[PDB]
Specification:
Four copies of one chain form a homotetramer.
Chain A lengths: L2 H16 L2
Chain lengths: 20, 20, 20, 20
């Protein structure tokens, strides 16, 4: 469940930034 | 899609490290 | 990398619905 | 965070199938 912050909190912010 | 193998890299590795 | 706007695009909504 | 091994399990298979 560590994974289930750290990966998500990266990706849901990197999505916003990345412009996917 | 430029965001892809710039985030996904740092995610598919983090999946493994995270232990999903 | 064209795997992009199919995968993440669903997943960013599935995130919001998932309550991650 | 129980949204994890539903949406992640899709994504880690969509990665493999997608060729990111």
């Amino acid at each position: 469940a560590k994974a289930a912050a750290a990966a998500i909190k990266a990706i849901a912010a990197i999505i916003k930034a990345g412009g996917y």
